[PDB]
C-alpha cells in the first residue's frame, strides 16, 4: 500500500503525468511523493514540486497543499511562474473556506468562520496587483468579487442576530463597519434598514432620518 | 454496562 | 522488558533444612522496606508492617512474647503503626522505626514501651546504636541522633534531598567517634558523635550527565569502615575507597547497586543492579570471579555463612555459592511468597524473613 | 470524506455585480478605507470553467 | 433565566457627566468619559454617549447624552435626557 | 593565496549562490589559512551541513561539503501504548519532519525528549534508540525503535505530621490514588506531575477550610523502588492551630461604594477562618464592582495572624481598575457550526462595557455545549485605542454524531436492551436529531426525536417526537392484555431560572388493545366507553385515537448530580384529553425528592422521597385501564414485587381461547371456573400515594479511602394505590378496593455504587405491614445500564 516501484525518475514522471491526465489523483500523489523523497533536489525538482501542488489540490488534501506552497515560496521566491503559485494558494484558501461536514446542498455556509475567505481575498489581491497581465487575472478578479460578497453577507448575518437579540448599539456599530469596509456589496443595501431600525428604537431620530434618506436614495 | 462510540 | 533469568540447574551437596518456621502478622507484604529479624542472646526479635512485634526463642522458635504497637481506640478503631525501620536489638532495649515519624523503644524482657519520640520525617534507615546514642537517617533529608536513655533528640544534621530518589535510606556506621553516612544525594559525609559537626564530605557519584527524570540519581547503601579506610557504594555509581581522615578517593570501580556488601579478609563481595554477585580485591578492586546466572532476580544482600555466600531471591529460592570460585554449591526452596529483605547470620544461626512475614532458621 | 471534493469543481460565477451606494445631498457615507477595495484589471484568460490550472511547462 | 441583563453604550456614572463643560477639547472629553462606543459617521462631529441598560425583565432605561463637537474640534452644545420619553 | 572560485562539491540542497553568499568572503580577495578556517566555521554555523572539508585544487578552493541529509522517512516500532501521531507531532515541534534536513545533533535532543516523554507516561525503564539508516543521495531513514519495559504505579500516599485527621481521610480527595479496588471505579495509579501539585493544593484547601490558618507544607518527596515499578509519595506538612476570625476591614480605592462593600463583608462573631468562604466573599466583592462597570477589579485579601488570642484579621485591599468597552466579539475555528450557535451562549454583549466574569461564564456555557473539544479566550486590544478591546474565542470543533448500545439487568426489568444513534448538531445549526430504542422484559419502545433548543432568542425550546410503544402486560406481573400504540408529540419548553422549567405541548396517541382478559374493572371501562364485549370470549380487540394537552413543571436544585447531599427536586406532570377524542379524562402526577444534610461535612443525610398521583374521567367516560398508576417494585416502595400493590383483578367465568390442563388461565371456565373469583393479579388503581424516609450514612465496614464512592442507607417506605371509581358495595364477597385507608409499609437497608458494569443498587426489605393478597419480594437488586 502506497509503495511505488524503484524505477528511473523519468519513468516516475511519465506514470505521474499519465495518472494525472487519467483522473486518479491519489496514485499520482503517491508517485510524486516517492519521486521527491527518492531524489532530494533532483534535476527537475521544481516540476515535481509544482506537480505535487496540483495533485494535492485535486485530491483535496488542502492542508498538505498549503504546506507545499509555503515550502516552495520559501525556497524559490523569484520562479518565473510564481504567479501560478500564488493563484494556487488563493484557490487552496477558497477551497478550505468551502467545506462541508455532510455535503454541499445550498446551506450557503455564509455565517461560518470566514478567516479562509479573508486569506483568499488577500492572496488574490496580491496576485492581481503583482501580475496584472497574467493568464489567471480574470478568475482572480471574479473570485475577489465573490469573496467580498461572502464577507459582506457574514457581516449582515451578525447584524441580523444582534437585531434579533436587541443589542441596538452593537447592530449600529456592525452595520457602520460593514458600510465602511464593503460599501459596494449588496449586503449593505439589505443591512441599512437594520441600522435605521436600531436608530429608531434608541429614541434617536436625526440619525434615523439620515439613514432613511440613504435608503430612499438607493433602491 | 454502557457503550458509547462517538463516530 | 529485561527477562527474569531461569533458576540454576545445580546439584546440591548438602541439603538446607529449616530448624523451625514461625509465623508473623502477614509480613511486609509487597511494600519495599528494610524490616528484618534480629538475633541477640539466643532470642529472635521480629516485626511486621501492621505493627506487631514478637520475641521468640532462637533454638526452636517458641513465642516468648508479642505486642501490637498499633494504636486502637476501642474495639472498632485501629490504625496500623507502619513499622518500616528494621530491628536493632542491642545493649538491651529494642528500637524500631516507622513511616509515621515514630521510633518505638521496647524492653527485651516483656516488651513494654520504654519511650516514644517524634522524628523529622519518615524513618526508614535501620537505627544504629553507638556511644550511648541512636542514629536515625530519615527520608526527609535529615539525620537525627537521639539519646539512648530518655529518647530525646540530641541533635540533627541536614543533608540535601534530590527530587527523585530510591526508596531507601543508608544506615550510618560509627568508628573512633565519627559516624559516616551516605545520603540520597551522592555525597558520603562524616559527622561527630557529640554534635552535628561536619568533618568532611566527598562526592562519589558517577555519570552525572543527562537532563531528564529518573536520571542517574545515585544513592548510598551502607558505608563500611575498616583499618581507617571507608568503602562506599552507590546506585549506578562507583564502588569507591575513601580515606577516613580526609575523604580522599583511593580507588574506584564502575559498578553500582543498592544492596549491602560484605568485607571479609581481603575480599569485598557485592551484588550489582542487574543481580550479579561478585568478589573484588580490597587493594584495587581487581575482579576475580563473576556469577551472572541469577540475572534480574531481585536478590537480597549476601550473607556469609561457613565460608559460603547465601542469597535469597524474589521467586523464593535461596542460593548457596562457594566464595572461593563463585560456583553454585546448593539451591533450596523455603517459601513461595518470595524473599525481599536482607537475612541475618549470628552465633552460627542463619535467619531470614519472607514477604509473608514467616521467619525461617536455616541449619545449613 | 470528500469534505472538499466538491471544491474540485466550483463555478459560482453568478454573484451579483457590485454597485456603489449613491450619496444623497446633505451627507456623506463614511470613508471606505480601501482595506478590501478590489482593483480594476482585465486578464488574458477565461473564467467560466474553461481556464486550466495545470502546471506550467518548464 | 429567560433573558440576561443586556447592556449597551457607554457608562455614564451620573457624576462624571456633570464633570464635562463647554469648551473642552476632544482629548479632554475622551479622558473625562471615554471613547464613545458609537458616533455619527455622516460627516459631522457628534458623539453619542448612550447609556442604554436593561436589568432583564425590569424594563429598558436609557440616558442619552448628545455631545456635539464644533468644526474647531471643541464642544458646542451639551444635550442629554435621562428618560426614554 | 588569492581565491577566485568555490566548487561547492556535493551541493544539491543549498543553492550555489546561497552557499557562496553565506560565507563572509568574496571572489578575488586574498585568502589565508585563517580566512579558510573562518569561512569553514561560518559555513558550519549556518546549520545546513554536517561536515565541511575544503581542498586547495590548483588556484581554486575545492570546498567539499557534506550536506545535511533530508529526512526520507521515520519508522517507529513497538509503541504499543502511544500512537505514532503524537510522536510525529513531537518531532515536528523540534523541526525534524519528513522532507527536512537532519542535522544529526538535534536528533539527540529529540530522543532525550522522547525518553522524558516515556518517563512521563509511566514507562520508566524503557529504552529509546534513534538509529539512522543511510540512503542514496545523502538520505536518512530515522528508525526510532524502543522497548517500553513495564509501567510503574503508585504504592503509597503517606502524610507525616498530621493530627486530628487520619491519612485515609486526607488522601481520599486526591486525584492520585494508591488503592483502587476492582469492584469500584476510583481511578488509575499512574503517576503524573501536575496532578501532584493539584493534590497538594487540594490538601492546602482542605486544611484551610477547617480554620488551620497556619498550615504550611514543609516539603514533598517522591521516591522510586530499585525495581522501578513502584512510586512512593510522601508529603511532610506542618499543621497549626484552629484560629478564629477577629474581623475584616476593606481598604483601598473602592470607587465610592464603601457601604455596599462593607455590607457584603460581614461576619458573625467568633467564626472559623474558612479560606473558601474568604475567597467567596472576595469574588462577591469582585462581582459587585464589575456590575457597576469595572472590567478588572482587583481584590487582595491578606490575613494578619495574632497567635496571642489565636485570631486572624482579613485586610482586603480593593482596587477597581478602569472601564473597557468590547468593540466586537469574534469566533475562530467554527468551520461547521454557524455563528448564531456560538454567539447565543455569550453572556457578554458586544458594544457594551467589559466584564471578565461574564466572559468566563460564556466560556463555561460553550464548554457545556459539547460541540467543542477546546475553547480558549483572548481579550485582545484594539490597536490605537486606550479603552477598547475585542474578545476573541478560539474553538476546536469536535465530532457530534454518536451511536450507543447499552445493556442492563434488574429485578423489575429482567434484562434491558438499549440502542440508539444521535446527532447533537445537525449540519451545525443547533438542531438535535436522535433515534432511540429500548427492549424491556414486558415492553418495547422506538423513538425518533428532533429538537430545536433555541426556538426563540430567549431560549425557549421546541421539540417533536414520534414513538411506537408495545406493552405486554402479561410479562409485567399484571392482568393479561397486549397494547400496541403509536403517536407523536410536539412540546415547548420555557426556562424561568436556573432551577425551574415549564413544558407545555400537544400530542396524539393511537392505542390498540388485544388479547384482553375478561375482568370486572376492564369491562366497566369498556361499558363506560360504549362497547360491551362477551365475557366468555378471551380474544378481544379494541382501538382508540386521542389528542391530549400535556403540561409539566420541573424544579431542580440538587447540589451534586450523583450521590446528592443537599437540595430539593420537585416534578409535576399532567395531561388532559382535549374535546374531539374517543377518551375524556385527565391525569396528574407529582414526585418529590429532598436531601437535607444533618452534619457539617454532608456525610449524614436525610432523603424525603414522596410521590402523589391522581386521575379521572371528565364526563361519563372512565380513565383508561391502560394508564392507571402502579406501586410496589423497587422504584416506589421496596419490599414488594413489581406492580403488586393495589386493587386485584376480578375475573369472569370465561373460556380461554388456548387452554392446557393444570393451567389457571385466569379463572377460566376451561379449568372449572363458573363465577367471579378474586386473584393476586394486580390491575393498578387510579390514585397513588407513596412516601419514603431514608437515612444516608457513611458505609461502616470499608477503608476510609474511597468511602464516599458507596452510598449506604436505611429506608422506611409507605405506599398505597386504590381505585376511586370502583362501584360502592358492588359485591360483599370482595374487599372494598376503593377504600384508601389500606396502607402498606416496609423497612430495609439499601446500598449503591458505581461498578465498572454500571450503577449497582442493592436493597433488602421487609414488608411488615403487607395486606392480604400482596406479593412479597425481599431482595431487590438492580444492575444499572
Judge contact between F329 and F390, C-beta under 8 A: yes
Length of chain D: 58
F627, F734: one domain: yes
Residues forming a β-bridge with F544 = F511
Write out the three cell numbers for A199. 436608530
F63, F81: one domain: no
Q: Which chain A residues have a beta carbon less than 8 Å from that of E52?
A: 168-169, 202
Closest CA to C223 of C273, C161, C180, C165: C180
Residue F440, classified by CB atoms within 10 Å of its CB into exposed (0-12), middle (13-18) or buried (19+), is: buried
As a dihedral over the C-alpha atoms of residue A90, residue A93, residue A99, residue A104, rounded to 10 degrees, the angle is -10
∠ CA C128-C130-C136, rounded to 5°: 35
The Cα C323–Cα C304 span in angstroms is: 9
F220, F271: one domain: no
Report how far apart the first and last C-alpha atoms of chain D are (Å, whole number): 34
Q: What's the reported resolution, in angstroms, to a tenth?
A: 3.3
Q: Which residues of F715-749 are buried (b: 16+ CB within 10 A; e: fewer)?
A: bbbbbbbbbebbeeeeeeeeebbbeeebebbbbbe
Phi, psi of C73 (to 5 degrees): -100, 90
Judge contact between A139 and D47, C-beta under 8 A: yes
The Cα C300–Cα C354 span in angstroms is: 11
The Cα F698–Cα F597 span in angstroms is: 13
Judge contact between F645 and F628, C-beta under 8 A: no
Sign of torsion over alpha carbons F640, F645, F649, F650: positive
- Residue F438 is assigned to a structural domain of this protein: no
Give Cα F191 distance to the centre of its chain: 24
Phi, psi of F559 (to 5 degrees): -70, -40
Judge contact between C95 and C88, C-beta under 8 A: yes
Helix (H, G, I), strand (E, B) or coil at E35: coil
F500, F641: one domain: yes
Closest CA to F723 of F577, F588, F625: F625
Helix (H, G, I), strand (E, B) or coil at F527: helix
Residues 6+ apart with CB under 8 A from C58: C39, C42, C43, C44, C347, C349, C351, C361
Which single residue is written with the C-alpha cell 531481585? Answer: C298
Q: Domain containing A148: what range?
A: 1-219
The Cα E68–Cα F727 span in angstroms is: 85
| Integer angstrom CA distances of residue F527 from D29, F138, F521, F522 | 80, 97, 10, 9
Q: What is the DSSP string of F474-530?
A: TTTTS-S-EEEEEEEEEEEEEEEETTEEEEEEEEEEEEEEESPPPBHHHHHHHHHHT
F311, F390: one domain: no
Judge contact between F681 and F665, C-beta under 8 A: no
Q: After which residues is chain F discontinuous, taking C to N > 2.5 Å? A: none
Which single residue is written with the C-alpha cell 514522471? Answer: A13
Write out the three cell numbers for F696. 444516608
- Residue F707 is assigned to a structural domain of this protein: yes
Write out the three cell numbers for A94. 477558497
Closest CA to A178 of D32, C103, E36, C87: D32
Judge contact between F434 and F453, C-beta under 8 A: no
The packing angle between helices A9-22 and A25-38, to 10°, is 160
Q: Do F401 and B7 touch (CB under 8 A)?
A: yes
Q: Do F335 and A113 touch (CB under 8 A)?
A: yes
| Integer angstrom CA distances of residue E43 from A127, A210, A213, C355, F8 | 35, 11, 15, 91, 65
Phi-psi region of C49 (alpha: psi -120 to 50; beta: other; left: phi over 0): alpha
The Cα E34–Cα E20 span in angstroms is: 12
Question: How many beta carbons lie within 10 A of that of residue C261, not counting itself?
Answer: 22
The Cα A201–Cα F785 span in angstroms is: 54
The Cα A176–Cα E38 span in angstroms is: 9
Which single residue is written with the C-alpha cell 423497612? Answer: F747
Closest CA to C133 of C184, C82, C95: C95
Question: How many beta carbons lie within 10 A of that of residue C75, not counting itself?
Answer: 6
Residues forming a β-bridge with C363 = none
Write out the three cell numbers for A56. 494535492
Give the E-state strand segments of F529-652 in sequence order. 541-556, 567-577, 585-597, 605-617, 648-651
Residues forming a β-bridge with F443 = F471
Question: How many beta carbons lie within 10 A of that of residue C8, not counting itself?
Answer: 13
The Cα F299–Cα F279 span in angstroms is: 10
Judge contact between A25 and A59, C-beta under 8 A: yes
Which single residue is written with the C-alpha cell 500564488? Answer: A86
Domain count, chain C: 1
Report the run of H or E that residue C251 belongs to, with start and end. Answer: strand C249-253
Residues 6+ apart with CB under 8 A from A82: A73, A76
DSSP code of residue C2: P
Q: Which chain A residues have a beta carbon less than 8 Å from that of D26?
A: 213
SS3 letters for C194-247?
CCCCEEEEEECCCCCCCCCCCCCCCCECCCEEECCEEEECECCCCEEEEECCCC
The Cα F124–Cα F277 span in angstroms is: 42
Write out the three cell numbers for A42. 533532483
> To probe the interface with B, which of F372, F406, F425, F783 has the most B CB atoms within 10 Å?
F406
Write out the three cell numbers for F168. 485515609
Residues 6+ apart with CB under 8 A from E59: none
- Nearest CB to F160; choose among C31, C101, C167: C101
Residues 6+ apart with CB under 8 A from F729: none
F37, F88: one domain: no
Q: From the CA of C171, how many Å to the nearest CA of chain F?
A: 17
F114, F222: one domain: no
Report the run of H or E that residue C279 belongs to, with start and end. Answer: strand C277-281
Q: Do C1 and F125 touch (CB under 8 A)?
A: yes
Kindly give the pairing relationship between strand C128-130 and strand C113-115. Answer: unpaired
The Cα F736–Cα F379 span in angstroms is: 73
DSSP code of residue D8: G
Question: Final residue of a domain: which of F107, F129, F147?
Answer: F147
- Nearest CB to F158; choose among C99, C163, C214: C99
Question: How many beta carbons lie within 10 A of that of residue F43, not counting itself?
Answer: 19
**Radius of gyration for chain F, computed over Cα atoms and rounded to the nearest angstrom:** 38
Which single residue is written with the C-alpha cell 438535535? Answer: F432
Residues forming a β-bridge with F127 = F147
As a dihedral over the C-alpha atoms of residue F38, residue F41, residue F46, residue F52, rounded to 10 degrees, the angle is 120
Judge contact between F261 and F252, C-beta under 8 A: no
DSSP code of residue F409: E
Q: Is E43 on the interface with D (CB under 8 A)?
A: yes
Question: How many beta carbons lie within 10 A of that of residue F266, not counting itself?
Answer: 8
Judge contact between C190 and C245, C-beta under 8 A: no
Q: Do F427 and A102 touch (CB under 8 A)?
A: yes
The Cα F351–Cα A170 span in angstroms is: 5
F519, F655: one domain: yes
The Cα F719–Cα F630 span in angstroms is: 10
The Cα F500–Cα C132 span in angstroms is: 75
Residues 6+ apart with CB under 8 A from F409: F415, F416, F782, F783
The Cα F340–Cα D19 span in angstroms is: 29
* Sheet strands side by side (includes F372-381): F352-353, F325-332, F388-397, F372-381
Question: How many beta carbons lie within 10 A of that of residue F248, not counting itself?
Answer: 18
The packing angle between helices A137-165 and A82-97, to 10°, is 30
F356, F335: one domain: yes
F51, F158: one domain: no
SS3 letters for F634-671?
CCCCCCECECCCCCEEEECCECCCCCCCCCCCCCECCC
The Cα B7–Cα F423 span in angstroms is: 10
Q: Do F459 and E2 touch (CB under 8 A)?
A: yes
Phi, psi of F433 (to 5 degrees): -130, 130
The Cα C253–Cα F511 span in angstroms is: 91
Give Cα F254 distance to the centre of its chain: 40
Domains and CATH numbers, chain E: 6-81 (3.30.1450.10)
- Nearest CB to F402; choose among B1, B2, B5: B5
Within 145-164 of A, beta carbons closer than 8 Å to D belong to 145-146, 148-149, 151
F250, F285: one domain: yes
Length of chain C: 364
Write out the three cell numbers for A86. 500564488
Give the E-state strand segments of F96-210 in sequence order. 127-135, 139-147, 153-160
Write out the three cell numbers for F477. 406481573
Give Cα C167 distance to the centre of its chain: 12
Report the run of H or E that residue F89 belongs to, with start and end. Answer: helix F84-93
Biggest CA-to-CA distance, chain E: 49
> To probe the interface with D, which of A99, A104, A117, A178 has the most D CB atoms within 10 Å?
A104
Judge contact between C128 and C191, C-beta under 8 A: no
Write out the three cell numbers for F283. 469574588
Judge contact between F442 and F475, C-beta under 8 A: yes
Helix (H, G, I), strand (E, B) or coil at F315: strand
Kindly give the pairing relationship between strand F325-332 and strand F388-397. Answer: parallel
The Cα C320–Cα C330 span in angstroms is: 5
- Residue F693 is assigned to a structural domain of this protein: yes
Closest CA to A90 of A36, A47, A129, A51: A129
The Cα F106–Cα F85 span in angstroms is: 20
Phi-psi region of D39 (alpha: psi -120 to 50; beta: other; left: phi over 0): beta
Q: Which chain D residues have a beta carbon less than 8 Å from that of E41?
A: 29-30
The Cα D31–Cα A99 span in angstroms is: 34
Domain count, chain A: 1
The Cα F449–Cα F467 span in angstroms is: 8
The packing angle between helices A82-97 and A62-75, to 10°, is 150
Report the run of H or E that residue F91 belongs to, with start and end. Answer: helix F84-93
Report the run of H or E that residue E38 belongs to, with start and end. Answer: strand E38-39
Residues 6+ apart with CB under 8 A from D52: none
F649, F586: one domain: yes
> To probe the interface with F, which of C31, C32, C160 has the most F CB atoms within 10 Å?
C32
Question: Final residue of a domain: which of F360, F377, F397?
Answer: F397
- Residue F448 is assigned to a structural domain of this protein: no
Residues 6+ apart with CB under 8 A from F269: none
Is chain D touching chain B, with at least 3 CB–CB pairs below 8 Å? no
Judge contact between D10 and A99, C-beta under 8 A: no
| Integer angstrom CA distances of residue D44 from A138, A140, F352 | 7, 12, 50
Amino acid at each position: 500500500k502506497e509503495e511505488v516501484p524503484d524505477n528511473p525518475p523519468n519513468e516516475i514522471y511519465a506514470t505521474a503525468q499519465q495518472k494525472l491526465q487519467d483522473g486518479n489523483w491519489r496514485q499520482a500523489i503517491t508517485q510524486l511523493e516517492a519521486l521527491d523523497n527518492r531524489y532530494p533536489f533532483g534535476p527537475y525538482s521544481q516540476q515535481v514540486q509544482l506537480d505535487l501542488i496540483y495533485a494535492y489540490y485535486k485530491n483535496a488534501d488542502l492542508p498538505l497543499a498549503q504546506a507545499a506552497i509555503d515550502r516552495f515560496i520559501r525556497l524559490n521566491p523569484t520562479h518565473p511562474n510564481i504567479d501560478y503559485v500564488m493563484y494556487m494558494r488563493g484557490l487552496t484558501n477558497m477551497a478550505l473556506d468551502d467545506s462541508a461536514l455532510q455535503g454541499f446542498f445550498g446551506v450557503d455556509r455564509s455565517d461560518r468562520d470566514p478567516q479562509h475567505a479573508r486569506a483568499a481575498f488577500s492572496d488574490f489581491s496580491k496576485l492581481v496587483r503583482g501580475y496584472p497581465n497574467s493568464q489567471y487575472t480574470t478568475d482572480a478578479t471574479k473570485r475577489l468579487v465573490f469573496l467580498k460578497d461572502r464577507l459582506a453577507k457574514y457581516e449582515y448575518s451578525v447584524a441580523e442576530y444582534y437585531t434579533e437579540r436587541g443589542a441596538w448599539v452593537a447592530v449600529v456599530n456592525r452595520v457602520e463597519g460593514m458600510l465602511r469596509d464593503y460599501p459596494d456589496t449588496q449586503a449593505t443595501r439589505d443591512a441599512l434598514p437594520l441600522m435605521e431600525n436600531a436608530y429608531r428604537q434608541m429614541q434617536m431620530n436625526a440619525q434615523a432620518e439620515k439613514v432613511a434618506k440613504i435608503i430612499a436614495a438607493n433602491s | 454496562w454502557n457503550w458509547t462510540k462517538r463516530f | 522488558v529485561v527477562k527474569m533469568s531461569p533458576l540454576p540447574t545445580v546439584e546440591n551437596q548438602f541439603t538446607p533444612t529449616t530448624a523451625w518456621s514461625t509465623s508473623v502478622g502477614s509480613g511486609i507484604g509487597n511494600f519495599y522496606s528494610n524490616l528484618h529479624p534480629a538475633l541477640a542472646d539466643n532470642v529472635v526479635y521480629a516485626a511486621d508492617r501492621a505493627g506487631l512485634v514478637k520475641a521468640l526463642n532462637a533454638d526452636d522458635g517458641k513465642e516468648i512474647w508479642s505486642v501490637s504497637l498499633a494504636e486502637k481506640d476501642g474495639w472498632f478503631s485501629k490504625e496500623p503503626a507502619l513499622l518500616s525501620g528494621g530491628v536493632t536489638v542491642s545493649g538491651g532495649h529494642v528500637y524500631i522505626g516507622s513511616e509515621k515519624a515514630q521510633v518505638y523503644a521496647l524492653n527485651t524482657s516483656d516488651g513494654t514501651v520504654a519511650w516514644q519520640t517524634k522524628v523529622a520525617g519518615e524513618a526508614l534507615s535501620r537505627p544504629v546504636v553507638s556511644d550511648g546514642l541512636v542514629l536515625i537517617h530519615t527520608s526527609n533529608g535529615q539525620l537525627q541522633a537521639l539519646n539512648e536513655a530518655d529518647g530525646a533528640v540530641k541533635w540533627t544534621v541536614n543533608l540535601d534531598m534530590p527530587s527523585l530518589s530510591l526508596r531507601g535510606e543508608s544506615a550510618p556506621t560509627t568508628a573512633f567517634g565519627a559516624a559516616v553516612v551516605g545520603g540520597d544525594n551522592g555525597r558520603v559525609s562524616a559527622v561527630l558523635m557529640e554534635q552535628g559537626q561536619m568533618i568532611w564530605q566527598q562526592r562519589i557519584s558517577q555519570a552525572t550527565g543527562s537532563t531528564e527524570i529518573d536520571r542517574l540519581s545515585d544513592v548510598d547503601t551502607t558505608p563500611v569502615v575498616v583499618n581507617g579506610v571507608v568503602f562506599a557504594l552507590a546506585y549506578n555509581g562507583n564502588l569507591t575507597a575513601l580515606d577516613l581522615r580526609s575523604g580522599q578517593i583511593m580507588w574506584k570501580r564502575e559498578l553500582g547497586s543498592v544492596n549491602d556488601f560484605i568485607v571479609d579478609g581481603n575480599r569485598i563481595y557485592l551484588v550489582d543492579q542487574n543481580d550479579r554477585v561478585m568478589a573484588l580485591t580490597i587493594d584495587g578492586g581487581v575482579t576475580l570471579w563473576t556469577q551472572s546466572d541469577l540475572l534480574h532476580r531481585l536478590l537480597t544482600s549476601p550473607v556469609l555463612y561457613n565460608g559460603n555466600l547465601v542469597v535469597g531471591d524474589s521467586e523464593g529460592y535461596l542460593h548457596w555459592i562457594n566464595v572461593e570460585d563463585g560456583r553454585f554449591v546448593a539451591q533450596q526452596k523455603v517459601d513461595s511468597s518470595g524473599f525481599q529483605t536482607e537475612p541475618v547470620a549470628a552465633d552460627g544461626k542463619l535467619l531470614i524473613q519472607a514477604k509473608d512475614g514467616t521467619v525461617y532458621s536455616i541449619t545449613r | 470524506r470528500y469534505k472538499r471534493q466538491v471544491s474540485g469543481d466550483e463555478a459560482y460565477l453568478e454573484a451579483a455585480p457590485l454597485a456603489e451606494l449613491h450619496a444623497p445631498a446633505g451627507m456623506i457615507l463614511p470613508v471606505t478605507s480601501g482595506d478590501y477595495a478590489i482593483p480594476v484589471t482585465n486578464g488574458s484568460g477565461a473564467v467560466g470553467k474553461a481556464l486550466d490550472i495545470r502546471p506550467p511547462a518548464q | 433565566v429567560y433573558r440576561p441583563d443586556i447592556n449597551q453604550g457607554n457608562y455614564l456614572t451620573a457624576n462624571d457627566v456633570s464633570k464635562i463643560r463647554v469648551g473642552m477639547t476632544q482629548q479632554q472629553v475622551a479622558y473625562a468619559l471615554g471613547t464613545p462606543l458609537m458616533s455619527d459617521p455622516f460627516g459631522t462631529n457628534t458623539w453619542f454617549y448612550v447609556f442604554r441598560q436593561q436589568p432583564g425583565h425590569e424594563g429598558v432605561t436609557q440616558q442619552t447624552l448628545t455631545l456635539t463637537f464644533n468644526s474647531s474640534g471643541v464642544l458646542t452644545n451639551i444635550d442629554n435626557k435621562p428618560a426614554l420619553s | 593565496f588569492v581565491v577566485k572560485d568555490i566548487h561547492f562539491e556535493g551541493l544539491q540542497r543549498v543553492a550555489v549562490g546561497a552557499a557562496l553568499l553565506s560565507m563572509p568572503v568574496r571572489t578575488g580577495d586574498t585568502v589565508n589559512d585563517e580566512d579558510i578556517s573562518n569561512t569553514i566555521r561560518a559555513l558550519f554555523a549556518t546549520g545546513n551541513f554536517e561536515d565541511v572539508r575544503v581542498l586547495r585544487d590548483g588556484d581554486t578552493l575545492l570546498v567539499q561539503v557534506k550536506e545535511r541529509p533530508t529526512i526520507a522517512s521515520i519508522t517507529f516500532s513497538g509503541n504499543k501504548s502511544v500512537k505514532d501521531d503524537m510522536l510525529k507531532q513531537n518531532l515536528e515541534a523540534s523541526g525534524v519532519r519528513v522532507g527536512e534536513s537532519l542535522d544529526r545533533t538535534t536528533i539527540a535532543d529529540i530522543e532525550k525528549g522522547l525518553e522524558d516523554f516515556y518517563y512521563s507516561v509511566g514507562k520508566y525503564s524503557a529504552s529509546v534508540k534513534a538509529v539512522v539508516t543511510p540512503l542514496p543521495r545523502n538520505r536518512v531513514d530515522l528508525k526510532l525503535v524502543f522497548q517500553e519495559g513495564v509501567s510503574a504505579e503508585i504504592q503509597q500516599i503517606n502524610i507525616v505530621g498530621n493530627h486530628a485527621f487520619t491519612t485515609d481521610e486526607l488522601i481520599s480527595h486526591f486525584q492520585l490514588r494508591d488503592e483502587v479496588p476492582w469492584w469500584n471505579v476510583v481511578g488509575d495509579r499512574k503517576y503524573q506531575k501536575q496532578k501532584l501539585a493539584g493534590d497538594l493544593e487540594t490538601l492546602r484547601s482542605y486544611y484551610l477550610d477547617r480554620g488551620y490558618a497556619r498550615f504550611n507544607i514543609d516539603s514533598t518527596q517522591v521516591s522510586l523502588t530499585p525495581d522501578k515499578k513502584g512510586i512512593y509519595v510522601t508529603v511532610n506538612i506542618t499543621e497549626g492551630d484552629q484560629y478564629k476570625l477577629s474581623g475584616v476591614e476593606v481598604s483601598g480605592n473602592l470607587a465610592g461604594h464603601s457601604a455596599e462593600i462593607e455590607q457584603l463583608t460581614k461576619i458573625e462573631p467568633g467564626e472559623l477562618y474558612n479560606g473558601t468562604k474568604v475567597t467567596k466573599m472576595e469574588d462577591d466583592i469582585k462581582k459587585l464592582l464589575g456590575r457597576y462597570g469595572y472590567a478588572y477589579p482587583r481584590v487582595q485579601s491578606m490575613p494578619e495572624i495574632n497567635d496571642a488570642d489565636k485570631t486572624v484579621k482579613l485586610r482586603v485591599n480593593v482596587d477597581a481598575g478602569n472601564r473597557f468597552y468590547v468593540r466586537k466579539i469574534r469566533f475562530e475555528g467554527n468551520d461547521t457550526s454557524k455563528d448564531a450557535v456560538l454567539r447565543r451562549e455569550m453572556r457578554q454583549m458586544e458594544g457594551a462595557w467589559l466584564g471578565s466574569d461574564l466572559v468566563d461564564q460564556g466560556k463555561e456555557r460553550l464548554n457545556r455545549l459539547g460541540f467543542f473539544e477546546t475553547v480558549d479566550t483572548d481579550t485582545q486590544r484594539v490597536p490605537g485605542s486606550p479603552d477598547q478591546v475585542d474578545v476573541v474565542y478560539k474553538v476546536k470543533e469536535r465530532n457530534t454524531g454518536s451511536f450507543n448500545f447499552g445493556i442492563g439487568y434488574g429485578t423489575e426489568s429482567g434484562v434491558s436492551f438499549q440502542a440508539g444513534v444521535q446527532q447533537d448538531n445537525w449540519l451545525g445549526t443547533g438542531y438535535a436529531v436522535g433515534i432511540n430504542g429500548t427492549k424491556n422484559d414486558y415492553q418495547t419502545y422506538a423513538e425518533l426525536s428532533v429538537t430545536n433548543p433555541y426556538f426563540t432568542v430567549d431560549g425557549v425550546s421546541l421539540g417533536g417526537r414520534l414513538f411506537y410503544n408495545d406493552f405486554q402486560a402479561d410479562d409485567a406481573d399484571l392482568s393479561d392484555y397486549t397494547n400496541k400504540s403509536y403517536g407523536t408529540d410536539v412540546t415547548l419548553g420555557f426556562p424561568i431560572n436556573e432551577y425551574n422549567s415549564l413544558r407545555a405541548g400537544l400530542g396524539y396517541v393511537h392505542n390498540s388493545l388485544s388479547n384482553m382478559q375478561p375482568q370486572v374493572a376492564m369491562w366497566r371501562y369498556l361499558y363506560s366507553m360504549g362497547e360491551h364485549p362477551s365475557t366468555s370470549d378471551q380474544d378481544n380487540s379494541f382501538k382508540t385515537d386521542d389528542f391530549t394537552f400535556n403540561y409539566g413543571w420541573t424544579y431542580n436544585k440538587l447540589d451534586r448530580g450523583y450521590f446528592p447531599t443537599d437540595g430539593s427536586r420537585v416534578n409535576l406532570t399532567g395531561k388532559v384529553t382535549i374535546p374531539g377524542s374517543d377518551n375524556e379524562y385527565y391525569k396528574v402526577t407529582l414526585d418529590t425528592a429532598t436531601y437535607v444534610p444533618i452534619d457539617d461535612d454532608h456525610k449524614w443525610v436525610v432523603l424525603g422521597r414522596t410521590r402523589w398521583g391522581y386521575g379521572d374521567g371528565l364526563g361519563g367516560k372512565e380513565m383508561p385501564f391502560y394508564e392507571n398508576f402502579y406501586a410496589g417494585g423497587s422504584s416506589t416502595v421496596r419490599g414488594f414485587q413489581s406492580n403488586t400493590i393495589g386493587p386485584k383483578a376480578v375475573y369472569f367465568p370465561h373460556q380461554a381461547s388456548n387452554y392446557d390442563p393444570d393451567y389457571d388461565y385466569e379463572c377460566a371456565t376451561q379449568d372449572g371456573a363458573k363465577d367471579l373469583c378474586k386473584s393476586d393479579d394486580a390491575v393498578g388503581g387510579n390514585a397513588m400515594a407513596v412516601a419514603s424516609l431514608e437515612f444516608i450514612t457513611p458505609t461502616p465496614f470499608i477503608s476510609d479511602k474511597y468511602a464516599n464512592s458507596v452510598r449506604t442507607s436505611f429506608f422506611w417506605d409507605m405506599g398505597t394505590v386504590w381505585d376511586t371509581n370502583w362501584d360502592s358495595s358492588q359485591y360483599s364477597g370482595y374487599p372494598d378496593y376503593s377504600d384508601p385507608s389500606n396502607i402498606r409499609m416496609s423497612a430495609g437497608i439499601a446500598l449503591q455504587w458505581m461498578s465498572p458494569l454500571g450503577p449497582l443498587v442493592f436493597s433488602y426489605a421487609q414488608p411488615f405491614k403487607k395486606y392480604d393478597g400482596d406479593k412479597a419480594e425481599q431482595f431487590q437488586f438492580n444492575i444499572g445500564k
